[PDB]
Amino acid sequence: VDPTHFEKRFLKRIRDLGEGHFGKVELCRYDPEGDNTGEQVAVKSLKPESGGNHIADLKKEIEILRNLYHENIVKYKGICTNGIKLIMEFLPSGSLKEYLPKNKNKINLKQQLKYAVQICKGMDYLGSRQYVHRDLAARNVLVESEHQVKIGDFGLTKAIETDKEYYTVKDDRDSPVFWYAPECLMQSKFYIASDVWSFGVTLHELLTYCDSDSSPMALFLKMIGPTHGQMTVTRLVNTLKEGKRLPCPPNCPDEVYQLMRKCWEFQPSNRTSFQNLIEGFEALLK
Ligand SMILES: Cc1cnc(NC(=O)C2CC2)nc1-c1c[nH]c2c(NC(=O)[C@@H](C)N3CCN(C)CC3)cccc12
């Protein structure tokens, strides 16, 4: 018997956890004994509404996650099998976007920086395997406990080819543009340093406890224009070309803000690394 093979007949849907266009994630219980004692699992599958290219994408995501093993990367459990489903561990506390606003009193600057280190460690692991994540935002970072976070979704993750510095995304459908580096918006080119940019934006979110009024979208839209529709991204590029970045969060030391700023150097080659960030945060923690 294969422990990563989940039979459809025992995989019982409890509720929806998240939904996009063409895909969804559900809370299921895997209950082979039929008495509600089975393990809860997060199940990602494709919607009938979805096109044909979306199945290939889900299969590639599965193969990526199947082979990643890290304390700060969400655990692959298996598959339920043309159509297919990805089975992952379920973390009840959900994402930082959901968890931080409800837990401010429990989570001080020290714990915020400890989470930041954990995000950087999972991301550095991903980078060592030549993947660019392309969706690094607080909503995709899961809370295991008050002491542990995990990178939690790999829907947009792509492999960077050997002897190559970036992946060019042909279809950039529903990209998180307010987390994206200039090269990503301008040329659809994704480097490891592009995830470092995104990490800086995620660090901002963490430091603001994912408050919606000071969210990356909100603050950038105030900077450029709430535009503007079709012109949003090109105006956003122009504001970034001018040198304008998200401001220092309230109660955020300049030292932490300077680490953030190094994520947002206009050129990818001049950005900080995840390892440099870890060392920076670790020196602030001691
Ligand atoms: C694995 C897991 C374990 N545990 C919890 N825990 C909980 O939900 C707690 C709160 C009850 N969640 C997840 C989880 C992993 N991915 C999720 C997504 N993913 C997306 O929507 C993807 C498709 N998009 C994200 C945005 N991106 C721009 C495009 C892709 C939505 C909702 C949940 C999950």
Rg (CA), the chain: 19
Read off the DSSP letter of residue 27: E
Nearest-CA residue for atom 12 of ligand 1: 94
Choose, from 135, 171, 211, 213, the residue flagged as catalytic. Answer: 135
69 and 91 Cβ atoms separated by less than 8 Å: no
DSSP-assigned letters across all residues of 17-85: EEE-SSEEEEEEEE-TTSSS-SEEEEEEEE-TTS-SHHHHHHHHHHHHHHT---TTBPPEEEEE----E
Measured in whole angstroms, how far is the alpha carbon of residue 77 from the centre of its chain?
Answer: 19
Query: Which tokens go with 280?
Result: 């920076």
Q: Give the Cα separation of 212 and 278 in Å (integer).
A: 27
Q: Give the Cα separation of 89 and 264 in Å (integer).
A: 33
Nearest-CA residue for atom 9 of ligand 1: 94
Query: Which tokens go with 253?
Result: 């030391």
- 84: buried, middle or exposed (CB in 10 Å: 19+, 13-18, 0-12)? middle
Cα-Cα-Cα-Cα dihedral of 96, 69, 6, 33, to 10°? -80
59 and 45 Cβ atoms separated by less than 8 Å: no
Is the shortest distance between the CB of 178 and ligand 1 below 6 Å?
no
Count the neighbouring beta carbons within 10 Å of the beta carbon of residue 133: 24
20 annotated binding-site participant: yes
- Largest distance between two CA atoms of the chain: 61
Q: Which residues pair with 167 in a beta bridge?
A: 190
Is the shortest distance between the CB of 24 and ligand 1 below 6 Å?
no
Would you call 213 a catalytic residue per the annotation?
no
Q: Give the Cα separation of 170 and 149 in Å (integer).
A: 31
CA of 241 to the centre of ligand 1 (A): 32
Q: Give the Cα separation of 8 and 6 in Å (integer).
A: 6
Backbone angles phi, psi at 62, to 5 degrees: -55, -50
Query: Which tokens go with 180?
Result: 């994206």
151 and 158 Cβ atoms separated by less than 8 Å: no
Alpha helices of 37-169 — where are they, by DSSP H? 53-66, 96-99, 109-128
CA of 153 to the centre of ligand 1 (A): 6
Q: Which are the contacts of 56, defined by CB distance < 8 A and separation ≥ 6?
A: none
Residue with token string 């339920």: 80
- Report the alpha-carbon angle 220-223-228, nearest 5: 80
Q: Resolution, in Å, please?
A: 1.7
CA of 243 to the centre of ligand 1 (A): 33
Pairing of strands 158-159, 167-168: unpaired
225 annotated binding-site participant: no
Residue with token string 């561990």: 89
| DSSP H helix total and E strand total for the chain | 9, 11
Q: Which residues pair with 218 in a beta bridge?
A: none
How large is the angle between the packed helices 192-207 and 274-285, nearest 10 degrees?
Answer: 30
Residues in the chain: 286
Q: Give the Cα separation of 214 and 161 in Å (integer).
A: 37
150 and 91 Cβ atoms separated by less than 8 Å: yes
Q: Which residues pair with 132 in a beta bridge?
A: 158
Nearest to 59 by CA among 44, 47, 74, 75: 44
Residue with token string 């995709």: 140
Is the shortest distance between the CB of 42 and ligand 1 below 6 Å?
yes
Is the shortest distance between the CB of 51 and ligand 1 below 6 Å?
no
Residue to probe by mutation, ligand 1, list 22, 27, 142, most atoms within 8 Å of CB = 142
Residue to probe by mutation, ligand 1, list 140, 171, 190, most atoms within 8 Å of CB = 140
Nearest-CA residue for atom 6 of ligand 1: 94
Q: How far is CA 236 from CA 217, 219, 224, 249, in A?
A: 10, 11, 6, 20
Residue with token string 């950005």: 271
Q: Which domains does the chain carry?
A: 1-90 (3.30.200.20), 91-286 (1.10.510.10)
171 and 146 Cβ atoms separated by less than 8 Å: no
**Which residues in the chain precede a discontinuity of more than 2.5 Å between C and N?**
81, 226
Q: Give the Cα separation of 47 and 22 in Å (integer).
A: 5
61 and 36 Cβ atoms separated by less than 8 Å: no
- Closest ligand 1 atom number to CA of residue 88: 1
Residue with token string 């809860």: 40
265 annotated binding-site participant: no
Taking the alpha carbons of 203, 206, 208, 213 in that order, is the dihedral positive or negative?
positive
- Solving technique: X-ray
Is the shortest distance between the CB of 90 and ligand 1 below 6 Å?
yes
Query: Which tokens go with 175?
Result: 């990209």
